């Protein structure tokens, strides 16, 4: 999904960190 | 085939941000 | 080692690039 | 293990492979 | 390369072929 | 512009595939 | 491995400096 | 965003080609 | 307004040169 | 040192990511 | 510099959050 | 070559356009 969720809009850090 | 190398970049997020974490990416 | 560090960015694209499909996991 | 066989020496893609 | 490869995803061994 | 962003990529993806082999890149 | 390293960042030099001439690269 | 993505490479250009001067960066 | 600039159009060496420093 | 360039551009592509809208400066 | 500190030891996200603006 | 040239020594912009 962070594919779905950041190729579309810019991801922060924090929301990034969630794939970690 | 933007995807793709969005996709590039994304890793290279993933690796900083995480760090002794590690993550994952499929 | 700050080296490791380095080195350990590019397995990383090396491995978007080879996994494709499968996607993988990394921990330092 | 990736680091301690691809940053000690050259790892090829179809070592790489192995990790994916 | 270019033209194949910036418009469709291209795999390692359509790459290859450049090399 | 976007072929010149595909094309840094493109060319770092050479850089693993061919390996010993090398390789060439133009426009 | 240090060589093998470099190596990625000098490719990537070589497209942005070499422009439309293209180049050749083999390690 | 592909506007992010062209940053990553307008700094990595900027590093090279601005050498021993350096450089200076904002998104605006 | 390097983003303006050169993110739309492809910038050369000489044009990227303006924001060193 | 020839590590130490290497290492820079790796720093800039972190400072890039990190900063986000504040922006940065580099210099060598 | 962030050379010194940075390329020397392995910095954090936090660590480098310093050098910016 | 190249490798010898600008992986022992920083090699500025001009010096890596002779490889082009
Ligand atoms: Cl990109
Ligand atoms: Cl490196
Ligand atoms: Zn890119
Ligand atoms: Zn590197």
Same mark, same amino acid.
């Given at each position: 999904?962070?594919?779905?969720?950041?190729?579309?809009?810019?991801?922060?850090?924090?929301?990034?960190?969630?794939?970690? | 085939?933007?995807?793709?190398?969005?996709?590039?970049? !994304?890793?290279?997020?993933?690796? !900083?941000?995480?760090?002794?974490?590690?993550?994952?990416?499929?």
């Amino acid at each position: 999904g962070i594919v779905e969720q950041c190729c579309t809009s810019i991801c922060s850090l924090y929301q990034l960190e969630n794939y970690c | 085939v933007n995807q793709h190398l969005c996709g590039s970049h !994304l890793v290279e997020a993933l690796y !900083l941000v995480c760090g002794e974490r590690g993550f994952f990416y499929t």
